[PDB]
Amino acid sequence: GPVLGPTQWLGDEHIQRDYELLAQELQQNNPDLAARTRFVDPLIAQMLRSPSKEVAERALGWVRPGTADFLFLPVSDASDTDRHQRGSHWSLLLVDRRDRGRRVAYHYDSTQGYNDGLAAELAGRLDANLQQAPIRQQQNSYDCGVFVLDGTRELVRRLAARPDLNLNNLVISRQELRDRLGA
Amino acid sequence: MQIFVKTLTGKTITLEVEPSDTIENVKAKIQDKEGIPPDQQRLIFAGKQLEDGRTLSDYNIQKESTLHLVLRLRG
Question: Which residues of B touch A16 (CB under 8 A)?
Answer without folding.
Answer: 49
